[PDB]
Curated annotation (Swiss-Prot), chain B:
Impact upon substituting W58 to F/R: Complete loss of entry of Semliki virus into the cell
The protein's name: Very low-density lipoprotein receptor
Disulfide cysteine pairs (residue numbers): C2-C14, C9-C27, C21-C36, C41-C53, C48-C66, C60-C77
Domain LDL-receptor class A: 1-38, 39-79
Tissue: Abundant in heart and skeletal muscle; also ovary and kidney; not in liver.
Disease the record associates with this protein: Cerebellar ataxia, impaired intellectual development, and dysequilibrium syndrome 1: An autosomal recessive, congenital, non-progressive cerebellar ataxia associated with disturbed equilibrium, delayed ambulation, intellectual disability, cerebellar hypoplasia and mild cerebral gyral simplification. Additional features include short stature, strabismus, pes planus and, rarely, seizures.
Role description: Multifunctional cell surface receptor that binds VLDL and transports it into cells by endocytosis and therefore plays an important role in energy metabolism. Also binds to a wide range of other molecules including Reelin/RELN or apolipoprotein E/APOE-containing ligands as well as clusterin/CLU. In the off-state of the pathway, forms homooligomers or heterooligomers with LRP8. Upon binding to ligands, homooligomers are rearranged to higher order receptor clusters that transmit the extracellular RELN signal to intracellular signaling processes by binding to DAB1. (Microbial infection) Acts as a receptor for Semliki Forest virus.
Native source organism of the sequence: Homo sapiens (Human)
Oligomeric and partner information: Homooligomer. Binds to the extracellular matrix protein Reelin/RELN. Interacts with LRP8. Interacts with LDLRAP1. Interacts with SNX17. Interacts with DAB1. Interacts with PCSK9. Interacts with PAFAH1B3 and PAFAH1B2, the catalytic complex of (PAF-AH (I)) heterotetrameric enzyme; these interactions may modulate the Reelin pathway. Interacts with STX5; this interaction mediates VLDLR translocation from the endoplasmic reticulum to the plasma membrane. Interacts with CLU. (Microbial infection) Interacts with protein VP1 of the minor-group human rhinoviruses (HRVs) through the second and third LDL-receptor class A domains.
Curated annotation (Swiss-Prot), chain C:
Full protein name: Spike glycoprotein E1
Record-annotated membrane-spanning stretches: 409-429
Coiled coil: none
Bridged cysteine pairs (disulfide): C49-C114, C62-C94, C63-C96, C68-C78, C259-C271, C301-C376, C306-C380, C328-C370
Residues on Cytoplasmic side: 430-439
Processing and modification events after translation: N-glycosylated.
The organism of origin for this protein: Western equine encephalitis virus (WEEV)
Classification of source organism: Viruses, Riboviria, Orthornavirae, Kitrinoviricota, Alsuviricetes
Amino acid sequence: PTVCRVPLAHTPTVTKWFKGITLHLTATRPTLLTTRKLGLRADATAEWITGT
Amino acid sequence: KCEPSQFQCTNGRCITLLWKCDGDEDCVDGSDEKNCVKKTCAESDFVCNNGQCVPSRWKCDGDPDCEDGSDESPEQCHM
Amino acid sequence: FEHATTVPNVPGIPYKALVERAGYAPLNLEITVVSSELTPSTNKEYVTCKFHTVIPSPQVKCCGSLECKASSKADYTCRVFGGVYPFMWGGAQCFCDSENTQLSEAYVEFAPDCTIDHAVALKVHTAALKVGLRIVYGNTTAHLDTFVNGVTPGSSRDLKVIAGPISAAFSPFDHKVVIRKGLVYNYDFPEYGAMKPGAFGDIQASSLYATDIVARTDIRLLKPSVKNIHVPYTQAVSGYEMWKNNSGRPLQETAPFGCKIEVEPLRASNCAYGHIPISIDIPDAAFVRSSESPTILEVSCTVADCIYSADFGGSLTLQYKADREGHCPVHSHSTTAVLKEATTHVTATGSITLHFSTSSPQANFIVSLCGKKTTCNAECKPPADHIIGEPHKVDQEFQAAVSKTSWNWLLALFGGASSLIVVGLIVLVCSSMLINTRR
Ligand SMILES: [Ca+2]
Ligand SMILES: [Ca+2]
């Protein structure tokens, strides 16, 4: 076991509206984006996002 | 204390493990250098008779550098 | 002495309560859930990883026969072939033209790199809850951990805290769980001793260094065809590799209630759900006689403006008069409005500004300054920021969640709809008795 170095993606810009947010993501190479609610049920999502 | 992937110097600081045994002094007291077993010397670093690694240009410059002063020895450099 | 309370199980938001006794000045009470753990009892079933087939050197007999033997190695397979006439670099290795018997073996073993890349199958029982509070009373602060069962007296020094049973029993783990390199998956692994080839758990053992590995990978041995020595064989795909390819997503990203799954030991940290019925035994040393505490002759509250935002989006001020000086506690006797400050200095006459928060469009709660309950009323507007980065500090009510004007409209409408019917009823009955008395 040891430590590697991994890239940090471009920080997204959030647009806020009523009961919902919008993410503006840029990524030159495939990147992972996961979400999950903090309620009783968790609508977990997973997506490999590339491009703007 | 800090997470085991980070080494803690004997001063109160924690740094990443890649800085340990790397040839560079990062802890304020140099605890990350004189603890490992590395002994390699580069081409430009002449190895003194005592085993210490010293730059080659240091040799026979008119002043003692090594602990035993092998650099100023007339055997090494002839005047 | 003893106080019974119900603090919501949210990790980080404070809870304010006011406890008092006759002849004793009221004392502020602050409860916080600093951190929570959900450690279930686990039992290790077996350890699995990517198997590495081992094909020992073939054994052949020039003119004779061999009998397959039985061995304890995992998925051992043996076969005997009738005529081979094998070759190596140097020519034929036997003199019988057709009486050459070849014996083939093939078993499985743990790959050398399995000490790092290996999964563990676990069975989890009922989960237990343990929390660490930051109870604050008077001018003192205490930290302690306790088990949420209703009987354990988890106490730092003399707090004597008894956290009652959790309102709702919840556990993010199903019965069978799988751990691999710190990632926890909810999987239904096959039971020990029943391995299906080509799936997870095709090879299992009680430990990585156990000598009783058992496996079933559907090894098939084939009849040799080429002249030079060979041990042809075919095998199922590594079930561990298949499961790795089709893992899905871990509990670190599927678990609900904002739980943070972590291992060593397997546990869920900082989950938010339900309520905890705590009970505190405050020592009498903290309480101070009412005569010593300064008294308020009068107090009137006026509120600047309010938005029912999650943060402390509200303000309040009050005038006061007292015959002394000191520290007094301020509390809001409502379930929809929480103050920010617990205590505040008082100096005869003056005015103090206190910040609060609410989730109702009415600041129509009661505020007490070491007694002397006072009534505030305001005109709470909705907030402007659609999204905030801080959890709501007060659970949304219903009876207070409706504006005074809307309450008035509905009340007036229902009142009219209930009044016209009764007035019609009464005029009907009076006329009916009039008609009955007519004759
Ligand atoms: Ca160093
Ligand atoms: Ca010199």
